[PDB]
Amino acid sequence: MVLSEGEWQLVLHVWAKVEADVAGHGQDILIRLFKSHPETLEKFDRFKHLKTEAEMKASEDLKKHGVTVLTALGAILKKKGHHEAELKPLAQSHATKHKIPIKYLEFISEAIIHVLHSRHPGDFGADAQGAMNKALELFRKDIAAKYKELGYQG
Template sequence: ICLSNSETPGVAGPWLCSRWQLSGLTSPPASVCRLFHDHPETLDRFERFKGLTTPDQMKASEDLKKHGVTVLTQLGKILKLKGKHEAELKPLAQTHATKHKIPVKYLEFISEVIIKVIAEKHSADFGADSQAAMKKALELFRNDMASKYKEFGFQG
């Protein structure tokens, strides 16, 4: 399964609209804060963020801002490769499987949150077709991560 030529703009356009907002951020990206708020169990994987229990604490965290920018930048690079992401994906999967031990379910959580946040912030440019394309692209990413996890002996 891969994105069709007609689905690609539905991912690229909204992603680029969101991505440009990463430079000059004064607080963590909304999708990362939303992930920790909606799925507090994900905080268990991040020792340095465990004390961030309120939205205000999350918004004030420089470490969380840096982490969020790193996550979204890396994901953006992978999405731009339109499925030809083996070189980018392998080291990411390796660290997530062997060092951080991030379950695939958590990748599903962040994917859902990213779609919600982009839909809220860019509703005019992120209709049903774009949301479906983004969902498909992120599902492909998760499936590829899950396959790599198995190669590294992590069932995640």
């Protein structure tokens, strides 16, 4: 809810490692999300027809959209919680157009933490993970607040 400057630096130190291969991370994150939570795939009319992990990895539009995800997320994270202006277009389209429940943001957050671990075994330790979780929690909480502002979600 408030992160220390140290936790923010951990988050941004890790994020520079994402920005080194945004496509790879975005792809992996989306695939982890769809594998571990197939219900989220159904929300993508563009991808719902991708079934094996092998198909997802070969979809360049899935990879493109991972880039879309992560660059939007990275913009937010670089604001270190001063992200109201960035969240509202995101909350607006995910509440009202995509109709994404906040719970699915929790799933993709777990997918992010997981993919960060498999792509950075020695870099993503307990501290950075604690920090990244706080930052994604703050993100989720502020998105949820923005949902209710738009009059949405339980």
